[model samples]
Target: LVQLSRHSIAFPSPEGALREPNGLLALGGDLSPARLLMAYQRGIFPWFSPGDPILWWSPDPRAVLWPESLHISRSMKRFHKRSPYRVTMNYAFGQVIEGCASDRETWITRGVVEAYHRLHELGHAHSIEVWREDELVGGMYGVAQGTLFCGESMFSRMENASKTALLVFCEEFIGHGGKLIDCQVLNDHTASLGACEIPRRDYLNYLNQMRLGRLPNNFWVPRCLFSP
Candidate 1:
């Protein structure tokens, strides 16, 4: 593992990452907005448990979802048709991130939260919030570049609330020419939602193509989505 001093902002090439752990790249770099954006642009992201030094990764078989390919089961479609929850983008971003970190064994540390919050302020980070009346029931947060969104974490206070946020977000993103949504390292939950693994090289191709364009900062608003 490469140790990055506090003053150093450069990350080692993503190709130098290890395979055994599936892309453990470097450690110790500060999570500044610039570094985080650069990492995402290169198909790399930070994922370390709380209290551990910052760890960056770029797995070989990267998990990603193309917005147009999102799958909504008949049951879920019906649920959305009558569900009381309403979705909003970039609303309560900090609260949404805090909810994601509320788990007993979460990787979202104070510093990590603060770092992403800074990104949100700069219009790089975004959130999709699910609301039932005035209460926030579920939500998700991530960083967006051009046509690619790097999803980080989500939480649901009620059944399927998180999934609702994801589905609505995907619909809106794809509606606006969004190409890909990076789920990074995946688990069964993401796979169930139609996410799949692609070779790291292929993932980089998408990221490289999209990162060159200037992304609209206000795309995360409620108007971006349509009514179910």
Candidate 2:
């Protein structure tokens, strides 16, 4: 079990992850807005399957992407050129979040959804929406702290719609003074988009720097870096 205070919780260690169960750190805790916000600030995240208790994790090999290093390959660039979807920032956060929950096998349980909704209301959370013909097709949401955006999850209705959302996210984040995007874990999709793995210590260093600064709070609205 982890120890929780009013605004934060502490995990035992990265080495405690079970060999068979990937990154299982601890279980049981409240998702109060403050605790959830602090978890991301410290490179920790809550993820567990249905029927499972609330679990927290902080894996050793952290996955992160520097906004300036987004590698736009020829194919993706062409796709963006031809793709008719319009990317918008925080225009419809609720819609964007609902899109993420649209998946059948989604791990974003209802409780998680509501918690993030509160965070969004506090302006500590945001989303990147990909719209097609004015209908939202996909998006990604995360909590931002200073220069870091800790991505929770993303989903799409069209092919690669989520990536389009991410590209716009990176663009606006960079333009708005954000520096890092923490993917938490690396998969083929994130890797292709240039997410690289870094040691826990190094990730903490970057996280610490971002934490020392002040992030824009309430009254902040998401906007696109490019205008049509």
Candidate 3:
């Protein structure tokens, strides 16, 4: 694995990442906003345990979701028809991230949280929050670049809360010129939500053309995306 310099935000190409453990690209870099954006731009991301140095990865098959292709299940569709939760974008980003890190055995360390918080402040990172009345029930956070959104983590305090966040956000995101969702890796959760695995190079191909110049003005404001 390559050891990254803390001073420079440059990252090795995702093509150079290893296939053994699957996409272990480099380590030791600080998670500055610049580096994090660069990482997302190159289809690489940091994922490591609490005690470990920042480990970057760009796996062989990247998982992605298309906003229009989100398969809203019958039950979720039913729920959406008269959903009790109100959804909003960029609302309670700090609380949402904290909720995502609240679980046991999480990779979302103190530094990681702070780094993403900084990104949020700079308008690179965003969140979708689900609220039931005044209480925050579920939410998600990620880094957005143009039409691509690199989803990081989600937390649900109640059933379907996180899914509600995603479904509601996807509709608004697509309406606002979003397209691909950089799910980063394939898991059953994402798979169930219609995310699929494509080659790393293919994901890289989608990265640039999908970024900048697509989204219109007033896209990331803290406003309601869905309400019921």
Please give the CA lDDT of all the candidate structures: 0.84, 0.78, 0.88
True-structure lDDT of candidate 1: 0.84
Best by lDDT: 3
- Candidate 3 lDDT by residue in tens digits, 34-73: 8888998878899998888789999989988988888888
lDDT of 1 by residue, 55-84 (tens): 999999899988877778899888998988
Better of 1 and 3 by lDDT: 3
What is the full ranking by TM-score, best candidate first? Answer: 3, 1, 2
Off by over 4 Å in 3: none
Among these predicted structures, which one has the highest TM-score?
Answer: 3
Sort all candidates by lDDT, best to worst. Answer: 3, 1, 2
Better of 1 and 3 by TM-score: 3
RMSD, each candidate, Å?
Answer: 1.8, 2.7, 1.2
Clashing pairs in 1: none
lDDT of 2 by residue, 195-220 (tens): 89998778888888986665445324
Evaluate model 1: give its TM-score: 0.93
Deviation (Å) of 129 in candidate 1: 0.2
